[PDB]
């Protein structure tokens, strides 16, 4: 892949909600930890890097990260891990939260520079359907699914990994085209 033109940072914040640590087995934590690393990698070489957050960060995920990266995570730029929930962290900007979920009635068509998009930091193979839709609804924040299913058909394999969703959002900032973004992340 070659990226075209000068890097211009984006104002979009992207949150990896890491509040589902207790729902995962150790292999799922390790898989997720590596998915977190890919998000940063995708962000680091993005044409429009976002401010990346990791909320409710701690527990086994944190331990696994330090064990694999041996401190490297501290040197990461546009990276903000915090023990705070995204609700605490963005108390003032609550109306700007959008929780991405495959279970949403809404569909995301365009990313707004003023908005804060949340990705549920969980590997569950979609075993916990509605987990994220339910959490967000009950908090009173908006949800939206990705406008795939003009792209993927049969059937409910429309549920992507954490880094795939991030990689797709990032490329959308680059290409402003959904299908292209899908084509490079999901070939
Ligand atoms: N098609 C899609 N549209 C929007 N967000 C999606 C998506 N597929 C995955 N995601 C995001 O990636 C995360 C990991 S997939 C985990 C699915 C989990 N059962 C849930 O209830 O959300 C999800 O929390 C969701 O934020």
Which residue has a Cα nearest atom 2 of ligand 1? 102
**Method for structure elucidation:** X-ray
Collapse the DSSP code of 39 into the 3-class scheme (helix H, G, I; strand E, B; otherwise coil) and give the result. helix
DSSP 72: G
Q: How far is the CA of 145 from the centre of ligand 1 (A)?
A: 8
Domain total of the chain: 1
Q: List the domain range (segments joined by +) for residue 179.
A: 1-187
Is the CB of residue 116 below 6 angstroms from any atom belonging to ligand 1? no
Ligand 1 pocket test: which of 142, 159, 168 has the largest number of ligand atoms within 8 Å of its C-beta?
A: 159
Residues 6+ apart with CB under 8 A from 146: 100, 102, 107, 108, 158, 160, 165, 168
Structure tokens at 126: 């979609």
Q: Using an 8 Å Cβ cutoff, are 96 and 51 in contact?
A: no
Nearest to 174 by CA among 15, 45, 76, 38: 45
Interatomic CA distance for residues 3 and 15, integer angstroms: 24
Is the CB of residue 135 below 6 angstroms from any atom belonging to ligand 1? no
Residue whose pair of structure tokens reads 């064990």 in the numeric block: 67
Q: Using an 8 Å Cβ cutoff, are 40 and 52 in contact?
A: yes
Resolution (A): 2.4
Q: Using an 8 Å Cβ cutoff, are 13 and 49 in contact?
A: no
Is the CB of residue 131 below 6 angstroms from any atom belonging to ligand 1? yes
């Amino acid at each position: 892949r070659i990226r075209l033109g000068k890097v211009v940072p984006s104002s979009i914040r992207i949150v990896l909600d890491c509040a589902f640590d207790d729902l995962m087995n150790d292999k799922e934590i390790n898989s997720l930890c590596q998915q977190v690393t890919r998000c940063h990698s995708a962000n680091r070489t993005a044409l429009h890097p976002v401010e990346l957050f990791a909320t409710n960060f701690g527990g086994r995920l944190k331990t696994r990260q330090d064990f694999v990266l041996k401190g490297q995570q501290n040197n990461w730029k546009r990276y903000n891990p915090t023990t705070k929930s995204y609700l605490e962290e963005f108390e003032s900007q609550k109306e700007k939260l959008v929780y991405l979920s495959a279970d949403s009635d809404n569909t995301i068509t365009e990313l707004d520079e003023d908005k804060i998009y949340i990705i549920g930091a969980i590997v569950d193979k979609n075993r916990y359907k509605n987990l994220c839709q339910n959490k967000a609804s009950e908090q009173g924040i908006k949800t939206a699914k990705l406008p795939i299913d003009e792209y993927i058909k049969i059937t409910d394999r429309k549920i992507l990994t954490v880094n795939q969703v991030f990689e797709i959002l990032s490329l959308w900032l680059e290409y402003r085209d959904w299908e292209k973004a899908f084509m490079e992340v999901i070939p």
